[PDB]
């Protein structure tokens, strides 16, 4: 088809929770706008210092109403956040899908899901381990390398209670994260307008997400498949033994 030229501005809102796919999404939404979409790796590797802006904003936002003023001043600091971006996905954005569609009306709406059990699994290995499991440790371990530490923690919960609207969460609890899980991905699909949403199955591929954004399938390029729980793990092992992301990251084309 022909190039055309493309905003530089939010155009599509990913609802999905973690483990559901966000990363490959990030990239293949990348790989179609050739600007940045935003994912907590971008935190993480990039823009750390955003983690107290999004604490910040998480605190304010109980005075969201469903625009008054309050709202108005919440709603600049979204947009503050997420200039430069092409899209949203993952924690700690995922919550605020709603809002986002307000700040953003052109924007669509994505929401990536999959097997209840198999994302609590995955969930357990790379974001949310057990207290009780000896694998939090080295996931600790590895954060400290990456210089993150108690308030990336925070954020990671406090950003999981907002997408949930709970005021307190048992992390430790698998039925709970299930059925917020269950209930989260229910209430996306019947709060946003079905023309405006697509859902998108864990393995879907480039043909429903390339239709509903009315561009081609990038040519020559298999639609991404990185950042199993396997290849967090052996990141998180090669973290702890280099004691830097720099030695290492030569290893990790594309999942960084
Ligand atoms: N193209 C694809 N096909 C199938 N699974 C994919 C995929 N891209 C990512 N995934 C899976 O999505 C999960 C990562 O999601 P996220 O980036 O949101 O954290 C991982 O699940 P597992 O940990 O079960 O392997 C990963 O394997
Ligand atoms: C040792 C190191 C590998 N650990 C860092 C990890 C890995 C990626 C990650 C991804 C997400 C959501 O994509 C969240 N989250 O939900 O806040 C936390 C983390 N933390």
Same mark, same amino acid.
């Given at each position: 088809?022909?190039?055309?030229?493309?905003?530089?501005?939010?155009?599509?809102?990913?609802?999905?929770?973690?483990?559901?796919?966000?990363?490959?999404?990030?990239? !293949?939404?990348?790989?179609?706008?050739?600007?940045?979409?935003?994912?907590?790796?971008?935190?993480?590797?990039?823009?750390?210092?955003?983690?107290?802006?999004?604490?910040?904003?998480?605190?304010?936002?109980?005075?969201?109403?469903?625009?008054?003023?309050?709202?108005?001043?919440?709603?600049?600091?979204?947009?503050?956040?997420?200039?430069?971006?092409? !899209?949203?996905?993952?924690?700690?954005?995922?919550?605020?899908?709603?809002?986002? +569609? %307000?700040?953003?009306?052109? !924007? *669509?709406?994505?929401?990536?899901?999959?097997? *209840?059990? @198999?994302?609590?699994?995955?969930?357990?290995?790379?974001?949310?381990?057990?207290? %009780? @499991?000896?694998? *939090?440790?080295?996931?600790?371990?590895? @954060?400290?390398?990456?210089?993150?530490?108690?308030? $990336?923690? *925070?954020?990671?919960?406090?950003?999981?209670? $907002?997408?949930? &609207?709970? @005021?307190?969460?048992?992390?430790?609890?698998?039925?709970?994260?299930?059925?917020?899980?269950?209930?989260?991905?229910?209430?996306?699909?019947?709060?946003?307008?079905?023309?405006?949403?697509?859902?998108?199955?864990?393995?879907?591929?480039?043909?429903?997400?390339?239709?509903?954004?009315?561009?081609?399938?990038?040519?020559?390029?298999?639609?991404?498949?990185?950042?199993?729980?396997?290849?967090?793990? &052996?990141?998180?092992? &090669?973290?702890?033994?280099?004691?830097?992301?720099?030695?290492?990251?030569? +290893? $990790?084309?594309?999942?960084?």
């Amino acid at each position: 088809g022909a190039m055309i030229e493309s905003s530089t501005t939010i155009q599509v809102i990913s609802a999905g929770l973690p483990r559901t796919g966000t990363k490959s999404l990030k990239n !293949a939404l990348e790989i179609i706008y050739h600007k940045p979409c935003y994912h907590m790796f971008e935190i993480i590797f990039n823009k750390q210092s955003d983690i107290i802006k999004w604490q910040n904003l998480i605190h304010d936002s109980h005075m969201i109403t469903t625009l008054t003023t309050k709202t108005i001043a919440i709603y600049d600091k979204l947009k503050e956040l997420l200039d430069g971006y092409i !899209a949203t996905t993952d924690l700690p954005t995922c919550g605020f899908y709603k809002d986002l +569609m %307000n700040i953003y009306p052109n !924007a *669509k709406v994505l929401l990536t899901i999959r097997d *209840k059990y @198999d994302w609590l699994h995955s969930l357990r290995k790379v974001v949310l381990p057990k207290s %009780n @499991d000896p694998w *939090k440790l080295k996931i600790e371990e590895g @954060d400290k390398v990456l210089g993150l530490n108690s308030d $990336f923690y *925070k954020l990671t919960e406090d950003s999981l209670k $907002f997408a949930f &609207q709970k @005021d307190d969460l048992n992390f430790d609890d698998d039925q709970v994260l299930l059925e917020c899980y269950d209930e989260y991905n229910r209430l996306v699909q019947e709060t946003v307008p079905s023309d405006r949403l697509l859902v998108l199955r864990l393995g879907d591929g480039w043909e429903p997400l390339c239709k509903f954004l009315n561009v081609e399938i990038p040519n020559g390029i298999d639609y991404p498949c990185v950042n199993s729980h396997h290849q967090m793990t &052996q990141l998180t092992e &090669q973290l702890i033994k280099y004691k830097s992301l720099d030695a290492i990251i030569h +290893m $990790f084309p594309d999942l960084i």
